[PDB]
Design a protein around this ligand. Structure first.
Ligand SMILES: [Cl-]
Ligand SMILES: [Cl-]
Ligand SMILES: [Cl-]
Ligand SMILES: [Cl-]
Ligand SMILES: [Cl-]
Ligand SMILES: [Cl-]
Lengths: 236, 236, 236
């Protein structure tokens, strides 16, 4: 057999079926299935969102220095509120003192309490000690009740000069003689002119002014004897 | 035909082509294509980032108690600033009072204002009422102008004792007789010794001291008749 | 050859092997492998976590208005602490003043310092100027030492009336005559009754009361001549 004309043919072996180049034999069903098996089978807007008027946020604690400087941003604490003591130049917190002229527990930021021991303008109070006033005292009504001695440079009552003891002798001097209408004398400033003596120590002005003019001695100067009665002024 | 030698062959059927075990027939093109189709076709560093000096952050509101204790961490509010009232032991805020000795609206944390009604050391003021001083008053200049009566234990002007009315009789006692140079008397303390009487009620000391020595009666005691003129002192 | 019976066969061409419909030829190994190649080869709980008592958080800065209103939530700054000035109606911060009656640097929220120039109740102080008191002064001990003149409506020492100069003439009037025991006179209130004259300008009361009764002239009125000696009271 050939491609061209008919004739005899044998069957291919298994080896020929697999090695499919032999052109001189024919393929049986059994070697279609042999031959197939070589082919078929092979943190900024946190910290920048600050506290303000308008909006809430975050806040730095003021140092004392910042608190005292009136810093409009920082926070005031218990400690820096306490630490900002009032002074004469800076608004601040104070302790009260009820004793004028004393600080309260050594604190310079002490102010006088409502009930401090001051004298006020309404009256009815007591100063428990002395007082000095450097110019005129005017008492507008009700006078003065004074325990102890008043010393004054001058004195007038309703425009009339007050009399003092040194003036007594000018009005009626020791040594004056008058008469007397009664039986007894009410004071020893005067004595009867019935002779006898007075004591120079009892009557020092009589002794100096009159001496022994009427007898007696220097210690016991004599009185005039003028015997109504006469009387003589012997002492102040 | 065989594998070994040449000879006759028939063609396989379709069924034989598919069931490829028959070794005794040959495969045509038409049954290559039949047989193929059985094979080919089958929250900590929030809350721990706190407010401080140095750094901003977060803050607890102080209770009053913490504010008053000077807590250095918490925040002061309007309410706890207001609530921290000054006392004698603790720095704080105050109301002002212009009236010494009165709290302002019942507030114990009241301090005297700059213009409270106090007496100061500079002068020129008025106390509208009484004043008591428990020891010596010194007026250093300008004296005193006193409306009303001064009562004093003692009085001196420039070191001389002030005279009082009870001393008048010692100097010139009722009952004294002197002479007189003028035609009329300027006071009724003295009377002419021209007899007649005085009234005991007008002249009680004359009546007691002299009685009816010179005539008259107890109510109308007689004066001496000594007829310059004589005069007698009849009353203070 | 046929499907049914045996006989002669030729071999298929390559073209027949590929176009596998020819039923009248047989397939060689070489055209199994040709024919196969057409088949085988073809931001709320931030802002709502607020500051409180109990818990930390976030805070709004108080305006002054809120601070002053005692707002219990907002924050106090240096500026609003400073800005909350004490008044009589509102607790606040103060400046101190040591001068009563003056604000410190024009600040209405000025309180008297512990050492302000006030008079207190304990004594020992000085008012450097005048003082007016509108009712009675009581000095409880130690009297008064007064530089300058005291004018008073009335005066008593230990309940006895103080004597004034206008009373002198009532006790012993100008014009009185008495006797005298000494050789010389200690004052010119009295003169010897030895004739001669006094000066009307030296002795105006004698001149008015006595005139020229004893001789002389109106300018130089005569004294009595009564020639112990007589004396006459010529002036106060
Ligand atoms: Cl006698
Ligand atoms: Cl002698
Ligand atoms: Cl008469
Ligand atoms: Cl009688
Ligand atoms: Cl003479
Ligand atoms: Cl004449």
């Amino acid at each position: 057999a050939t491609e061209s004309v008919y004739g005899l043919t044998r069957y291919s072996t298994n080896d020929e079926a697999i090695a499919g180049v032999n052109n001189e034999s024919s393929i049986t069903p059994a070697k279609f299935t042999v031959a197939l098996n070589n082919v078929f089978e092979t943190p900024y807007t946190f910290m920048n969102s600050t506290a303000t008027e308008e909006y809430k946020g975050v806040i730095k604690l003021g140092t004392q220095s910042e608190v005292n400087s009136n810093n409009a941003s920082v926070a005031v604490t218990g400690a820096t509120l306490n630490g900002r003591g009032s002074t004469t130049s800076m608004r601040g917190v104070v302790k009260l003192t009820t004793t004028a002229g004393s600080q309260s527990g050594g604190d310079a930021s002490s102010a006088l309490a409502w009930n401090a021991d001051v004298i006020h303008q309404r009256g009815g109070q007591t100063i428990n000690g002395t007082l000095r006033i450097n110019n005129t005292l005017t008492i507008a009504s009700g006078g003065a009740n004074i325990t102890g001695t008043v010393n004054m440079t001058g004195g007038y009552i309703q425009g009339k000069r007050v009399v003092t003891q040194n003036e007594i002798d000018r009005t009626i001097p020791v040594g004056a003689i008058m008469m007397w209408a009664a039986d007894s004398l009410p004071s020893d400033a005067w004595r009867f002119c019935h002779g006898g003596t007075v004591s120079a120590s009892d009557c020092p002005l009589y002794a100096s002014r009159i001496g022994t003019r009427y007898g007696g001695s220097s210690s016991n100067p004599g009185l005039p004897d003028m015997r109504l009665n006469y009387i003589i002024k012997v002492k102040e």
